[PDB]
Write a protein that holds these residues in place. Structure first.
Motif, PDB file in Angstrom:
ATOM      1  N   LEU B  51       0.872  -1.180   0.000  1.00 54.56           N
ATOM      2  CA  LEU B  51       0.000   0.000   0.000  1.00 54.56           C
ATOM      3  C   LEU B  51       0.907   1.226   0.000  1.00 54.56           C
ATOM      4  CD1 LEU B  51      -2.827   1.190   0.160  1.00 54.56           C
ATOM      5  CD2 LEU B  51      -2.704   0.677   2.750  1.00 54.56           C
ATOM      6  N   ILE B  52       0.740   2.104  -1.005  1.00 57.73           N
ATOM      7  CA  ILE B  52       1.500   3.364  -1.056  1.00 57.73           C
ATOM      8  C   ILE B  52       0.668   4.418  -0.325  1.00 57.73           C
ATOM      9  CG2 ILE B  52       2.289   5.314  -2.467  1.00 57.73           C
ATOM     10  CD1 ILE B  52       2.900   3.547  -4.656  1.00 57.73           C
ATOM     11  N   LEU B  53       1.275   5.034   0.680  1.00 58.38           N
ATOM     12  CA  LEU B  53       0.661   6.140   1.398  1.00 58.38           C
ATOM     13  C   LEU B  53       1.627   7.296   1.507  1.00 58.38           C
ATOM     14  CD1 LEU B  53      -1.224   4.186   4.287  1.00 58.38           C
ATOM     15  CD2 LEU B  53      -2.172   5.121   2.100  1.00 58.38           C
ATOM     16  N   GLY B  68      -2.276   3.845  -2.984  1.00 62.21           N
ATOM     17  CA  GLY B  68      -2.228   2.985  -4.136  1.00 62.21           C
ATOM     18  C   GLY B  68      -1.993   1.559  -3.669  1.00 62.21           C
ATOM     19  N   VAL B  69      -2.687   0.603  -4.293  1.00 56.53           N
ATOM     20  CA  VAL B  69      -2.511  -0.828  -3.998  1.00 56.53           C
ATOM     21  C   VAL B  69      -1.492  -1.382  -4.981  1.00 56.53           C
ATOM     22  CG1 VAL B  69      -3.733  -3.056  -3.896  1.00 56.53           C
ATOM     23  CG2 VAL B  69      -4.892  -0.948  -3.151  1.00 56.53           C
ATOM     24  N   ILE B  70      -0.477  -2.057  -4.446  1.00 58.00           N
ATOM     25  CA  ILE B  70       0.462  -2.763  -5.273  1.00 58.00           C
ATOM     26  C   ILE B  70       0.209  -4.265  -5.122  1.00 58.00           C
ATOM     27  CG2 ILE B  70       2.882  -3.032  -6.010  1.00 58.00           C
ATOM     28  CD1 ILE B  70       1.786   0.024  -5.754  1.00 58.00           C
ATOM     29  N   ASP B  71      -0.149  -4.880  -6.229  1.00 55.73           N
ATOM     30  CA  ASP B  71      -0.413  -6.302  -6.250  1.00 55.73           C
ATOM     31  C   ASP B  71       0.864  -7.090  -6.032  1.00 55.73           C
ATOM     32  OD1 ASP B  71      -3.231  -5.936  -6.835  1.00 55.73           O
ATOM     33  OD2 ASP B  71      -2.610  -5.504  -8.887  1.00 55.73           O
ATOM     34  N   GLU B  77       7.068  -0.658 -12.422  1.00 56.79           N
ATOM     35  CA  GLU B  77       7.645   0.310 -11.604  1.00 56.79           C
ATOM     36  C   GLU B  77       6.564   0.829 -10.660  1.00 56.79           C
ATOM     37  OE1 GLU B  77       8.912   3.937 -13.595  1.00 56.79           O
ATOM     38  OE2 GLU B  77      10.007   4.507 -11.820  1.00 56.79           O
ATOM     39  N   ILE B  78       6.948   0.943  -9.417  1.00 50.79           N
ATOM     40  CA  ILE B  78       6.070   1.474  -8.374  1.00 50.79           C
ATOM     41  C   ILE B  78       6.036   3.003  -8.534  1.00 50.79           C
ATOM     42  CG2 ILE B  78       5.805   1.836  -5.906  1.00 50.79           C
ATOM     43  CD1 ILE B  78       6.852  -1.092  -5.616  1.00 50.79           C
ATOM     44  N   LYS B  79       4.869   3.562  -8.831  1.00 51.07           N
ATOM     45  CA  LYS B  79       4.776   5.020  -8.996  1.00 51.07           C
ATOM     46  C   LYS B  79       3.910   5.586  -7.890  1.00 51.07           C
ATOM     47  CE  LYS B  79       5.682   5.062 -13.867  1.00 51.07           C
ATOM     48  NZ  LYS B  79       5.617   5.966 -15.053  1.00 51.07           N
ATOM     49  N   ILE B  80       4.188   6.833  -7.566  1.00 49.67           N
ATOM     50  CA  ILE B  80       3.432   7.461  -6.522  1.00 49.67           C
ATOM     51  C   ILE B  80       2.455   8.393  -7.220  1.00 49.67           C
ATOM     52  CG2 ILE B  80       3.483   8.883  -4.417  1.00 49.67           C
ATOM     53  CD1 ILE B  80       6.576   8.375  -4.486  1.00 49.67           C
TER      54      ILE B  80
ATOM     55  N   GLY C  54      -9.226   3.239  -4.346  1.00 43.69           N
ATOM     56  CA  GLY C  54      -9.392   3.536  -5.765  1.00 43.69           C
ATOM     57  C   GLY C  54      -8.483   2.633  -6.543  1.00 43.69           C
ATOM     58  N   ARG C  55      -8.704   2.580  -7.862  1.00 41.26           N
ATOM     59  CA  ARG C  55      -7.793   1.914  -8.770  1.00 41.26           C
ATOM     60  C   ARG C  55      -6.945   3.030  -9.316  1.00 41.26           C
ATOM     61  NH1 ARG C  55      -8.485  -3.597  -8.753  1.00 41.26           N
ATOM     62  NH2 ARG C  55      -6.367  -3.534  -9.621  1.00 41.26           N
ATOM     63  N   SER C  56      -5.723   2.732  -9.690  1.00 41.69           N
ATOM     64  CA  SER C  56      -4.789   3.770 -10.139  1.00 41.69           C
ATOM     65  C   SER C  56      -5.240   4.435 -11.417  1.00 41.69           C
ATOM     66  CB  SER C  56      -3.345   3.225 -10.273  1.00 41.69           C
ATOM     67  OG  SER C  56      -3.254   2.248 -11.275  1.00 41.69           O
ATOM     68  N   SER C  57      -5.814   3.664 -12.337  1.00 41.93           N
ATOM     69  CA  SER C  57      -6.084   4.261 -13.636  1.00 41.93           C
ATOM     70  C   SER C  57      -7.201   5.244 -13.505  1.00 41.93           C
ATOM     71  CB  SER C  57      -6.380   3.195 -14.677  1.00 41.93           C
ATOM     72  OG  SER C  57      -7.327   2.310 -14.138  1.00 41.93           O
ATOM     73  N   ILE C  58      -8.120   4.944 -12.608  1.00 39.22           N
ATOM     74  CA  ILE C  58      -9.286   5.764 -12.338  1.00 39.22           C
ATOM     75  C   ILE C  58      -8.872   7.047 -11.606  1.00 39.22           C
ATOM     76  CG2 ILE C  58     -11.416   5.779 -11.152  1.00 39.22           C
ATOM     77  CD1 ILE C  58     -11.449   3.692 -13.337  1.00 39.22           C
ATOM     78  N   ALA C  98     -13.376   1.045  -8.079  1.00 33.22           N
ATOM     79  CA  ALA C  98     -12.655   0.899  -6.810  1.00 33.22           C
ATOM     80  C   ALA C  98     -12.336  -0.567  -6.567  1.00 33.22           C
ATOM     81  CB  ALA C  98     -13.510   1.446  -5.691  1.00 33.22           C
ATOM     82  N   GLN C  99     -11.767  -0.863  -5.416  1.00 37.68           N
ATOM     83  CA  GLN C  99     -11.451  -2.253  -5.131  1.00 37.68           C
ATOM     84  C   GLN C  99     -11.610  -2.415  -3.630  1.00 37.68           C
ATOM     85  OE1 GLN C  99      -7.247  -3.191  -5.622  1.00 37.68           O
ATOM     86  NE2 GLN C  99      -7.028  -1.007  -5.999  1.00 37.68           N
ATOM     87  N   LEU C 100     -12.062  -3.587  -3.250  1.00 28.90           N
ATOM     88  CA  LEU C 100     -12.202  -3.903  -1.866  1.00 28.90           C
ATOM     89  C   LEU C 100     -11.019  -4.775  -1.487  1.00 28.90           C
ATOM     90  CD1 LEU C 100     -14.087  -4.033   0.806  1.00 28.90           C
ATOM     91  CD2 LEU C 100     -14.879  -6.209  -0.077  1.00 28.90           C
TER      92      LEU C 100
HETATM   93  O1  LIG Z   1      -0.223   4.137  -6.485  1.00 29.87           O
HETATM   94  C1  LIG Z   1      -0.086   3.152  -7.228  1.00 29.87           C
HETATM   95  C2  LIG Z   1      -1.115   2.258  -7.541  1.00 29.87           C
HETATM   96  C3  LIG Z   1      -0.859   1.190  -8.435  1.00 29.87           C
HETATM   97  N1  LIG Z   1       0.400   1.012  -8.942  1.00 29.87           N
HETATM   98  C4  LIG Z   1       0.673  -0.122  -9.850  1.00 29.87           C
HETATM   99  C5  LIG Z   1       0.743  -1.361  -8.939  1.00 29.87           C
HETATM  100  C6  LIG Z   1      -0.592  -2.044  -9.176  1.00 29.87           C
HETATM  101  O2  LIG Z   1      -0.583  -3.474  -8.998  1.00 29.87           O
HETATM  102  C7  LIG Z   1      -0.810  -1.649 -10.628  1.00 29.87           C
HETATM  103  C8  LIG Z   1      -2.254  -1.723 -11.092  1.00 29.87           C
HETATM  104  O3  LIG Z   1      -2.990  -0.788 -10.324  1.00 29.87           O
HETATM  105  P1  LIG Z   1      -4.587  -0.616 -10.586  1.00 29.87           P
HETATM  106  O4  LIG Z   1      -4.775   0.188 -11.833  1.00 29.87           O
HETATM  107  O5  LIG Z   1      -5.326  -1.867 -10.879  1.00 29.87           O
HETATM  108  O6  LIG Z   1      -5.079   0.020  -9.359  1.00 29.87           O
HETATM  109  O7  LIG Z   1      -0.399  -0.323 -10.750  1.00 29.87           O
HETATM  110  C9  LIG Z   1       1.402   1.894  -8.636  1.00 29.87           C
HETATM  111  O8  LIG Z   1       2.532   1.766  -9.113  1.00 29.87           O
HETATM  112  N2  LIG Z   1       1.154   2.956  -7.803  1.00 29.87           N
END
Ligand SMILES: O=c1ccn([C@H]2C[C@H](O)[C@@H](COP(=O)(O)O)O2)c(=O)[nH]1
Ligand SMILES: O=c1ccn([C@H]2C[C@H](O)[C@@H](COP(=O)(O)O)O2)c(=O)[nH]1
Ligand SMILES: O=c1ccn([C@H]2C[C@H](O)[C@@H](COP(=O)(O)O)O2)c(=O)[nH]1
Lengths: 112, 112, 112
Positions: B51-53, B68-71, B77-80, C54-58, C98-100
């Motif tokens: 989880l990015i906070l 942001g959720v990181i799967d 690349e992890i982006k903020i 939230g989802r990142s793309s959204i 969004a995501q739970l």
């Molecule tokens: O703040 C965030 C959120 C997501 N992701 C990357 C990791 C997630 O697994 C992937 C897909 O995100 P979603 O679009 O499904 O939320 O994007 C980031 O790098 N930063």
């Protein structure tokens, strides 16, 4: 100072421990993020960290609580980072504004 | 690319692994959400997600980090995801802007 | 009403269960926080609580989802608290907004 153990849960199923501001405060959008005092102090239960989140009803009334991470060993006062989103928001002393959620602190090999 | 294992924890009690932007960037409110590069890549430790906070001091300075959720199996690349809330925010290379928190990935029977 | 068990995971590694709005809705910044219906209801798996993110793309498209805590024993409809940040946002029925995420509910001695 009051410890986290003095917080109450609203319901046995409630994930969060309720947090109120100790002060009456008025927030406007142009003020930006403000730190509201709670009078509650860390530290947290062993192997846990804390997450401050908003309550839904409060969020819906236009007060955004910014997610805050509370470290396990933080001994300072837990403050709620908040911002009025669109309108003038008025926080009365003792309104439950946010909630503290406890989560497992996962051990990793990352260098400290 | 650098892996999550290269991140450092600020303190042994720190829940989060610090994240910086690799670039100097200026953000204004009218720009809306921006994705800041970190140069850090998934994937995550087995059975965890990320989880990015934001960090509190950064939030208080007017930079909102969107949760942001990181799967677990993300290898990009992890982006903020960030936005200046009210004012012009300037992010210098190497300012620690956000933090990655690792959480347990609970197994459920939901259909994939 | 549909239960959480009917939600799908996007990928086996996906931390979150995808949430869509059941309605087509248009959001403008001046509207402030809005609660979007999902048609999905609590309660959650024993010893877990839920976090709506939230989802990142959204998020990058200008729709902010406010972190919401879902209590383990909540039996109402799971709604997504959302706000258009800068621009007019249009949410089409069935867009995954969004995501739970399910997290462990830690037991504490706090008074209920
Ligand atoms: O703040 C965030 C959120 C997501 N992701 C990357 C990791 C997630 O697994 C992937 C897909 O995100 P979603 O679009 O499904 O939320 O994007 C980031 O790098 N930063
Ligand atoms: O909403 C918040 C976020 C943080 N903190 C306290 C607890 C944290 O351990 C400490 C340091 O936070 P950072 O600046 O590193 O995020 O500040 C709060 O009181 N409220
Ligand atoms: O984004 C959210 C946040 C909360 N709730 C529901 C589930 C919670 O258990 C209940 C009460 O929330 P609070 O007002 O106490 O935060 O509202 C939602 O549907 N969506």
């Amino acid at each position: 100072k009051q410890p986290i153990s003095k917080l109450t849960r609203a319901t046995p199923g409630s994930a969060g421990l309720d947090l109120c501001s100790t002060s009456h405060t008025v927030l406007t959008p142009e003020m930006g993020p403000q730190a509201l005092s709670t009078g509650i102090y860390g530290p947290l239960p062993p192997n846990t960290f804390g997450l401050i989140l908003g309550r839904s009803s409060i969020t819906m009334k236009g007060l955004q609580v910014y997610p805050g991470v509370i470290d396990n060993d933080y001994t300072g006062e837990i403050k709620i980072m908040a911002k009025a989103v669109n309108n003038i928001v008025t926080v009365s002393q003792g309104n439950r504004i946010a909630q503290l959620i406890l989560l497992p602190l996962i051990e990793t090999d990352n260098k400290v």
